[PDB]
UniProtKB/Swiss-Prot annotation:
Compartment(s): Nucleus
Cellular component, GO annotation: catalytic step 2 spliceosome; nucleus
Record note on quaternary structure: Component of spliceosomal complex.
Biased composition (Polar residues): 25-34
Described function: Component of a spliceosomal complex that is required for activating pre-mRNA splicing.
GO BP annotations, alphabetical order: mRNA cis splicing, via spliceosome; mRNA splicing, via spliceosome
Source organism, top-level taxon: Eukaryota
Keywords: Coiled coil, mRNA processing, mRNA splicing, Nucleus, Spliceosome
Protein family according to the UniProt entry: Belongs to the CWC15 family.
Originating gene: cwc-15
Protein name per UniProt: Spliceosome-associated protein CWC15 homolog
Length: 58
RNA sequence: GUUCUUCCGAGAACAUAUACUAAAAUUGGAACAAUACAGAGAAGAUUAGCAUGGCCCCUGCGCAAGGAUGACACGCAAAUUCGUGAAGCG
């Protein structure tokens, strides 16, 4: 019988790869996109119809 | 060891703790080249390719991509339990 060509009847699980569960388990090889980028965080301006002021604004 | 003190051969200050310390002696752990054999995924054959899984790697700068689809998988799969009437006995 053929059985190697099977789908995922069994559930997928994870949470144990490189650097998961312990921060020292990151290898010093890191991916090209793991470079620091977009490091200045944007925020929404003051008076953006913020929730409490919006609530007031019935 | 130096700049100074003098009663004279001593005194004050400056200077302040190197080194996985070995020229060694010991003790684990990987792949190498090839005589003969029989030889590489899918209900006949030629057989794609891409997936899926874990206490399996290798090449790669790599969330790219290759390594036979990289290899494997390839059936006792029972795993919460019964219910019935004939005929021997005794
Ligand atoms: Mg093929
Ligand atoms: Mg591949
Ligand atoms: Mg190939
Ligand atoms: Mg594969």
């Amino acid at each position: 019988m053929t059985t190697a060509h099977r789908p995922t009847f069994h559930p997928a699980r994870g949470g144990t790869a490189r650097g998961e569960g312990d921060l020292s388990k990151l290898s010093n090889q890191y991916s090209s996109k793991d470079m620091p980028s977009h490091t200045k965080m944007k925020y929404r301006q003051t008076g953006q119809e913020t929730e409490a002021d919006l609530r007031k604004k019935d």
